[PDB]
A and B are shown apart, each in its own frame.
Chain A
Amino acid sequence: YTDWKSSGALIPAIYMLVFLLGTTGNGLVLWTVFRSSREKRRSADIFIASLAVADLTFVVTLPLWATYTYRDYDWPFGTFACKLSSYLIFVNMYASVFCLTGLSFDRYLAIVRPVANARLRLRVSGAVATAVLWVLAALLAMPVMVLRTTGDLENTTKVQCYMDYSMVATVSSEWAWEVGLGVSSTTVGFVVPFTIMLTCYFFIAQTIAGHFRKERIEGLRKRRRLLSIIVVLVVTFALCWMPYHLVKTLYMLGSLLHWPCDFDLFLMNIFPYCTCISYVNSCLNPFLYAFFDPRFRQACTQDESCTTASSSLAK
C-alpha cells in the first residue's frame, strides 16, 4: 500500500513541467483572445476563452500539490488554501470537459446542421451555454469543496490536504458516500460530455467525408486531413482523460473486487502519473484549438471583379 520509491522523486518534476507548458500555452491563448476579440468576432471563441480560463486555473493550483507530494504528501499551506485549491482543480476539470464538449456541439451545429446555425443567435446562445456550464461546474464541485479538509498527521505531524468523508459519511456510510460521489463525479465529468462529443464529431466526420467526396486529388487530400484532425482531437481527449476516470472507476470497482496485494499498489503508484497525463489536454490545447485557428497564427506574427455595366442594343 506504500508509494513507489521513485514516485516522489518525479511527481513534482512532471508537475513542474506541466506548470511551464500549461502556463505558456493557456495564458498565451487567453492573452491572444483578449488581444484579438473584436478582430475575430466569432461566437464559438467564447468556449475557447472559457476553456483557456479553466485550463489556466486548472494548472495555477499545481505548485501547491507538487510541494504536497514533495514532503511525503505533506501540505505546508493553509487549510482554506487546500479547500480552494481542490475545489478549483475539480471545477476546472469539469469546465474543461464541458467547454470541449460545447465546442464539439457548436461545430456539429455549424457543420451538420448549418441551415439552423444562422437561425440561432449564436452570440447569446453561447453566452448562456457558458453561464450554465460554469454554474453547473461550480455546483458539481461544491461537494468536493465541503468535504475538503486538512490533517491526517497520524501521530506523524504531517498536515496534509485531502477530501474528508467523516463529516458527512457515518461509519457504515463511508463506502456508500465515497462510491456515490465518485460515480457522480466520473459520469458528469467524462461520460455525458464524452458521448456528446463523440456523436458530434462522428456526424462532423460523416458530413465532411460526404462533402469532400466530390472533386479529385486536392479534395480527397483535404478530406483526409480534416478526418485526421478530427481523429487527433478525439484521440487526444481519450488518451488524456481516460486514464484518470478509468482509475477512479477501477478504485470503485475494487472497493468490492478487492484487488489483493499488487494491482491496488499499481493504482496508487500510477494515479499521480494519471493526473500528469490528464494535464496533456490542458497543455496542448493552444496547438489544437488556438493554433488550429488561423487568427491565432496571424496574431502571433488581376483579381478585381470589375462591375456589371450596360450597353445599347439598337434595333
Chain B
Amino acid sequence: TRVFKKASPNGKLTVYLGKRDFVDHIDLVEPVDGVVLVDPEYLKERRVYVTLTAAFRYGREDLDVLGLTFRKDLFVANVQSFPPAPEDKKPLTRLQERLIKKLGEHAYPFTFEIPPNLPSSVTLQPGPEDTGKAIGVDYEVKAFVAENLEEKIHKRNSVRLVIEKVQYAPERPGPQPTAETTRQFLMSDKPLHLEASLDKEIYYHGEPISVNVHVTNNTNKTVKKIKISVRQYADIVLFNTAQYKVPVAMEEADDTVAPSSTFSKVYTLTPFLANNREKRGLALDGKLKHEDTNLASSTLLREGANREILGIIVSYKVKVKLVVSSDVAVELPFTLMHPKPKEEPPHREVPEHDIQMTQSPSSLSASVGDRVTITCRASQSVSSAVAWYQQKPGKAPKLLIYSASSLYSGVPSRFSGSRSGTDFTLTISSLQPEDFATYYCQQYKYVPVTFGQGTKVEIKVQLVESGGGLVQPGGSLRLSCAASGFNVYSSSIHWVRQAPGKGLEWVASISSYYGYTYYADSVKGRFTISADTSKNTAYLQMNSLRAEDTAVYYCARSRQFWYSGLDYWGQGTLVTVSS
C-alpha cells in the first residue's frame, strides 16, 4: 500500500494521511486518521495542533469591499498531537499504528471524526473566465506549530492537505421512478395521461437514463413535441436557502400524438460534462486542485433530518414535457452517484496531460509450475499507476493487473503485481500451460500512455472492429469499432496499434464525458478519433497514411471513471498500408 505525505515549508512538520477520499455513510462518516512527524529540536516547548476544517467558499474572490472574505467554516475540530495529551485514550487505527512503526518515535497520531450530517465536497463550475477560486464546500487538514490555540498561525510551519468527503451509491436498488400526470383542458371529455417512467433509481455516472413515455391523448388537442431533460438541482443553504436547477442533457423529440391516439417510446438521455462545460454554476465533484471532475454525485440524506444543513446538496430529476398545441410535465427523481470503488478514486485525470517503460527480460523461457518474475522500470515516477496485460498470439490483450498491485476480476490468483519505487514487477507463482504469451506493462499516469517492449513469456461486453484493407498508400480509412454493452460516456475508447512484430503503441483516445480526444505525436494531425452514440460506435478516420502505420489496430475500452485499464478489447483490423 501507499500513503500521502505533505511536508511543511520549513521541513519540520510532515502530515501523513492514508487516503484523500473519506466515505460518508448516511449514519457514520469515516474518521480522518493520520500521523504528524514532528522534530523536537525546532519544538523547544511549542505544540503541534492539527485541525480539520470543513469550509464553504460561497463567494468568488474576496476583498470586494476591501476586507470581506466569503468562506464559512462549517465544522472545525482541533486535536493536539504533540505533546500527547494523556486524556486522549484513543485506540490507534491500523494505518496510524503502521505509520508510527515506519516512522521513529517522533511520529504522533491524530484522528478526527466528521459529524454525520455535513455537506460533501463539491465545487460549482468556475465558468470559462473566473480564475481565482471555485465556489463550493471543501475539507482541509492543517497541521501547524504554535504555543497557543490563538497564536498567529505561521505559514512557514503549517501543512495543508485538502481531503474529500464523498458518498457512494447504495447497494440495494431503489423503487422504479414512474410518475404520471393526468391533465384536462377546456374539452373535458377525457384528459392527457402522460405516464413517463425511468428504468431504475440508481444511475451510475455516464450511464443512460431510459424514459418510457406512454401517452394517450384522449383529448382533441395534439402534442407537437416531447422535451426530455435531466436537470441537476443544487440546493445551497448558506444563510439564504436556494435551489438552482441547471439542465445537463436534453432531447427535443418531435414525436407527435394524434387526438384520441396512443404513443409509446423509450427515450435515452445521458448526462455528461462535455456539453455542459459552459454552464456556469454547475455542481461538480470535489476537486483537490484545478482538475477535471465529473458532475456532482447525488447527496444522500437521512429521512426527516435535513436541518437546513449548510452547504450544497445535489439531486437530479428527469423532466419530461409534452408541448400540447400548457405544458404537461412529469419529474422523476434519480440518484446519480459513483459505485463504491475497490481502489480509491484518482483525484487527478488518470492519463494526465512521455514516460519510457524499459521492460525486462525481453525473452525468457521456463518450465511449467515455476515462479517467473518480470520487471519494468519507468523513466519517471508513475505513482503505482501501471497495468499489466497479456496477449496470446493472434489475440487481444487482457488486463491482468491494474494499479500495479490489484488483480482483475477473473484472472488467476497466481499473477501478482508489486512495486519497488519506479520498478513495477509482475510475478507468476505457478506457471501453468495457459501462460505462454506476451506480457505488456502500460503506464497510464501521463499521456502518451506508454507501453513496454513486451516480455515474451514462453511455456518451454464486446467490441467488434472493421475497416482494414491493403489499400491507400497515402489515402484515408475509417475504422469502425462497434461497442455492445457499453456507453461511450461511462467509458473511453482508446485506439492502440501494434505493428507486425512490435509492441503496442497508443494511437488515439476519446473520452466523451469530458469530451477530450488525445493523439500520439506521430498521428497528431493525421488521425481523428470520434465516437458517436447512435450505435455506441467509435470511428478512427485515418488520413495521410504512411508505410509506418501498417498495424493490427485495436479498439480498447477504459473505465471513463477511475481509469483502471484497457480491460475490454476488440479483434483488431490489419491496416496494410503498402504499395
Contact = CB atoms under 8 A, between A and B. Distances in A.
Interface of A: 41, 107, 110-111, 113-119, 121, 123, 204, 208, 211-212, 222-223, 225-226, 229-230, 292, 294, 302-315
Nearest to A219: B67
Contacts of A229: 65-66
Contact of A306 (B6, B59, B130): B6
B4 A308 contact: yes
Given A229-B66, A313-B2, A313-B18, 12 more contacts: A113-B240, A114-B60, A115-B238, A118-B280, A121-B280, A302-B155, A304-B9, A309-B4, A310-B2, A311-B5, A312-B2, A313-B99
B68 A306 contact: no
Nearest to B158: A305
Contacts of B8: 306
B444 to A, nearest CB: 16
A107 B68 CA distance: 11
A118 B155 contact: no
B214 to A, nearest CB: 36
B429 to A, nearest CB: 19
Nearest to A306: B7
Interface of chain B, main secondary structure: loop
B10 A115 contact: no
Nearest to A221: B67
A302 B383 contact: no
8 contacts: A107-B65, A111-B64, A111-B68, A114-B58, A115-B59, A292-B66, A294-B66, A310-B4
Interface of B: 1-10, 16, 18, 58-60, 64-70, 95, 98-99, 102, 124, 126-127, 129-130, 135, 155-156, 159-161, 236, 238, 240, 242, 244, 280-281, 383, 419, 421
Nearest to B73: A214
Nearest to A292: B66
Given A118-B135, A118-B281, A308-B161, A110 B64 contact: yes
A226 B67 contact: yes
Contact of A114 (B59, B129, B419): B59
Contacts of A115: 58-59, 135, 236, 238, 240, 242
6 closest A-B pairs (Cβ-Cβ)?
A114-B59, A119-B281, A302-B156, A222-B67, A302-B9, A313-B3
A211 B68 contact: yes
Nearest to A226: B67
A1 B240 CA distance: 57
A208 B236 CA distance: 20
A118 B135 CA distance: 8
Contacts of B244: 119
A123 to B, nearest CB: 8
B310 to A, nearest CB: 12
A127 to B, nearest CB: 14
Contacts of B60: 114, 117-118
Contacts of B280: 118-119, 121
B9 A306 contact: yes
A302 B155 CA distance: 8
B495 to A, nearest CB: 31
A79 B383 CA distance: 81
Contacts of B95: 313
A209 B20 CA distance: 36
A119 B155 CA distance: 33
A84 B383 CA distance: 72
Given A306-B9, A310-B5, A313-B3, A117 B59 contact: yes
Contacts of A314: 102
Which among A204, A292, A308 has the highest number of chain B CB atoms within 10 Å?
Answer: A308
Given A294-B66, A305-B160, A311 B3 contact: yes
A87 B238 CA distance: 47
A226 B63 CA distance: 11
A112 B68 CA distance: 11
Given A308-B4, A309-B7, A226 B68 contact: yes
A204 B67 CA distance: 13
A165 to B, nearest CB: 45
Contacts of A303: 9, 155-156
Contacts of B156: 302-303
Contacts of B126: 118
B10 A302 contact: yes
Nearest to A223: B67
B65 A111 contact: yes
Contacts of A225: 67
B316 to A, nearest CB: 18
Nearest to A210: B239
Contacts of B4: 308-311
A226 to B, nearest CB: 5
Nearest to B72: A211
A117 B61 CA distance: 11
A310 B4 CA distance: 4
Contact of A208 (B58, B65, B99, B124): B65
Which among A113, A118, A222, A310 has the highest number of chain B CB atoms within 10 Å?
Answer: A118
B42 to A, nearest CB: 13
A294 to B, nearest CB: 7
B102 A313 contact: yes
Contacts of A117: 59-60
Contacts of A116: 242
Contacts of B6: 306-309
Nearest to A211: B68
Contacts of B383: 310
A300 B70 CA distance: 29
A38 to B, nearest CB: 12
B92 to A, nearest CB: 14
Contacts of A212: 67-68
Nearest to B94: A315
Contact of A310 (B3, B127, B129, B236): B3
Nearest to A307: B6
